């Protein structure tokens, strides 16, 4: 969809505002997936 017109690549410290804008949600649970159903648990690392 995009050829690379990139002029430069910038790097700086990310504040909590940046991290929260990146985020699609908060991971509140240690669980990964269900052992029986192999389904990702809600609010988990794989949610």
């Amino acid at each position: 969809l995009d050829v690379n017109f990139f002029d430069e690549l910038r790097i700086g410290l990310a504040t909590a505002e940046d991290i929260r804008q990146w985020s699609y949600g908060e991971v509140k649970k240690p669980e990964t997936i269900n052992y029986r159903t192999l389904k990702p648990e809600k609010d988990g690392l794989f949610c």
């Binding site: 969809l1 995009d2 050829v3 690379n4 017109f5 990139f6 002029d7 430069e8 690549l9 910038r10 790097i11 700086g12 410290l13 990310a14 940046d18 991290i19 990146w22």
Partner: protein, 68 residues
């Protein structure tokens, strides 16, 4: 990911090999840097930050036009 499939199409149809896209390795690098709390943006010539994604409609437009 799009360049490889389009390349196979181009060879199988006897067409020219298309122009390459963006490596997934660079996107992965950016995601890792972000996961390190490094804010890494790709700037265009005008100074704005480009957002890297892919259009979903292209595969749906071709797949839908396939049947008629």
């Amino acid at each position: 990911t799009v360049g490889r499939v389009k390349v196979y199409e181009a060879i199988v149809k006897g067409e020219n090999i298309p122009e390459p896209g963006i490596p997934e390795s660079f996107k992965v690098l950016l995601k890792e840097l972000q996961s390190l709390c490094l804010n890494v943006e790709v700037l265009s010539s005008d100074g704005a930050a480009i957002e890297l994604r892919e259009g979903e409609d292209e595969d749906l437009e071709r797949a839908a036009a396939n049947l008629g």
